[PDB]
Design an enzyme around this catalytic site. Structure first.
Site, PDB file in Angstrom:
ATOM      1  N   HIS A   1     -42.615  83.510  98.388  1.00  0.00           N
ATOM      2  CA  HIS A   1     -43.304  83.548  99.676  1.00  0.00           C
ATOM      3  C   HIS A   1     -44.399  82.488  99.741  1.00  0.00           C
ATOM      4  O   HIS A   1     -45.346  82.512  98.947  1.00  0.00           O
ATOM      5  CB  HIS A   1     -43.923  84.932  99.932  1.00  0.00           C
ATOM      6  CG  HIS A   1     -42.915  86.019 100.148  1.00  0.00           C
ATOM      7  ND1 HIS A   1     -43.226  87.356 100.024  1.00  0.00           N
ATOM      8  CD2 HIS A   1     -41.603  85.967 100.482  1.00  0.00           C
ATOM      9  CE1 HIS A   1     -42.150  88.083 100.273  1.00  0.00           C
ATOM     10  NE2 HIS A   1     -41.153  87.265 100.556  1.00  0.00           N
TER      11      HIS A   1
ATOM     12  N   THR B   1     -45.817  92.358 103.336  1.00  0.00           N
ATOM     13  CA  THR B   1     -45.009  93.347 102.628  1.00  0.00           C
ATOM     14  C   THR B   1     -45.823  94.086 101.575  1.00  0.00           C
ATOM     15  O   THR B   1     -45.293  94.917 100.842  1.00  0.00           O
ATOM     16  CB  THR B   1     -43.757  92.729 101.986  1.00  0.00           C
ATOM     17  OG1 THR B   1     -44.152  91.767 101.007  1.00  0.00           O
ATOM     18  CG2 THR B   1     -42.872  92.055 103.049  1.00  0.00           C
ATOM     19  N   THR B   2     -47.111  93.766 101.497  1.00  0.00           N
ATOM     20  CA  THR B   2     -48.052  94.541 100.695  1.00  0.00           C
ATOM     21  C   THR B   2     -49.204  94.993 101.590  1.00  0.00           C
ATOM     22  O   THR B   2     -49.446  94.391 102.639  1.00  0.00           O
ATOM     23  CB  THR B   2     -48.619  93.720  99.524  1.00  0.00           C
ATOM     24  OG1 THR B   2     -49.277  92.554 100.032  1.00  0.00           O
ATOM     25  CG2 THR B   2     -47.503  93.300  98.573  1.00  0.00           C
TER      26      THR B   2
ATOM     27  N   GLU C   1     -37.150  90.787  98.229  1.00  0.00           N
ATOM     28  CA  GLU C   1     -37.579  91.770  99.211  1.00  0.00           C
ATOM     29  C   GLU C   1     -36.583  91.820 100.365  1.00  0.00           C
ATOM     30  O   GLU C   1     -36.030  92.874 100.666  1.00  0.00           O
ATOM     31  CB  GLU C   1     -38.990  91.456  99.699  1.00  0.00           C
ATOM     32  CG  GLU C   1     -40.025  91.547  98.591  1.00  0.00           C
ATOM     33  CD  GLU C   1     -41.402  91.890  99.112  1.00  0.00           C
ATOM     34  OE1 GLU C   1     -41.969  91.090  99.888  1.00  0.00           O
ATOM     35  OE2 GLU C   1     -41.905  92.974  98.760  1.00  0.00           O
TER      36      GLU C   1
END
Ligand SMILES: [Zn+2]
EC number: 4.2.1.1
Length: 256
Positions: free
Chosen positions: A115, A194-195, A102
């Site tokens: 992560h 990031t989601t 990412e």
């Protein structure tokens, strides 16, 4: 909301307007404009008492979940104030070795990105932490393809049992210390999940040193499914969000 052509990250802003916010992640890390900050302390990772519970396919990725009802596995120091508890870790990867991470470093993409998600204990639980600007601390670690990572193999072997969305399996006695690189030098900046829901509650800590995994190891990631059992098969690949604008933010480095 997924990563397809009709519901991928470029559509997310329609349901989650914060997607176009001021501190969105991930970002490109420009190593030449990152500011060395001597005031930054070394990271303190204490994972010796970690209690993994379960591994789950949630349709976005697979999560390895930990017991976070006590200070068993915590992150401290660095740019952080206070104690952050490990709740889960997951990966983002690509359909090809040349993409999947990412974050990027000087525009370079890695094969995948790990992560490790921690929450600030002063807020009582994860659900409350995500509503705070300093609620989460996520440790980001790049994966490159090369030698196999022995400490990752236990995860790889269990993936067959959670091929489809919603599937879960007992996953005890996994030690996350096997996933860390030698050096803990890092870049840090304020950002978001990031989601979805993409909340801007994350202090990102991105390690400079990548770990190596084998082609066969990352290959098995790519055999998972976005879909649930009985539904048309869609390989779980390229579950990564593209880099977002840095805007009014400075990336700091713990090293020179
Ligand atoms: Zn992630």
């Amino acid at each position: 909301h997924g990563y397809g052509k009709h519901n991928g990250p470029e559509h997310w802003h329609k349901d989650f307007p914060i997607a176009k916010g001021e501190r969105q992640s991930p970002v490109d890390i420009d190593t030449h404009t990152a500011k060395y900050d001597p005031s930054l302390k070394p990271l303190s990772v204490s994972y010796d008492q970690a209690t993994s519970l379960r591994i789950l396919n949630n349709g976005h990725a697979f999560n390895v979940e930990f017991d976070d009802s006590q200070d068993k596995a915590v992150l401290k120091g660095g740019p952080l104030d206070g104690t952050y508890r490990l709740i889960q870790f997951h990966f983002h990867w690509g359909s090809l070795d040349g993409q999947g991470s990412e974050h990027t470093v000087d525009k370079k993409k890695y094969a995948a990105e790990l992560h490790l998600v921690h929450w600030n204990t002063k807020y009582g639980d994860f659900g409350k932490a995500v509503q705070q600007p300093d609620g989460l601390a996520v440790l980001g670690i790049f994966l490159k393809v090369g030698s196999a990572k022995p400490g990752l193999q236990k995860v790889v072997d269990v993936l067959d049992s959670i091929k489809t969305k919603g599937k879960s399996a007992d996953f005890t006695n996994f030690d996350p210390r096997g996933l860390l690189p030698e050096s803990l030098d890092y870049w840090t900046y304020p950002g978001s999940l990031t989601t979805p829901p993409l909340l801007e509650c994350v202090t990102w800590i991105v390690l400079k040193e990548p770990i190596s995994v084998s082609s066969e190891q990352v290959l098995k990631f790519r055999k998972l499914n976005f879909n649930g059992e009985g539904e048309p098969e869609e390989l779980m690949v390229d579950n990564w969000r593209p880099a977002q604008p840095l805007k009014n933010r400075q990336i700091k480095a713990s090293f020179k």
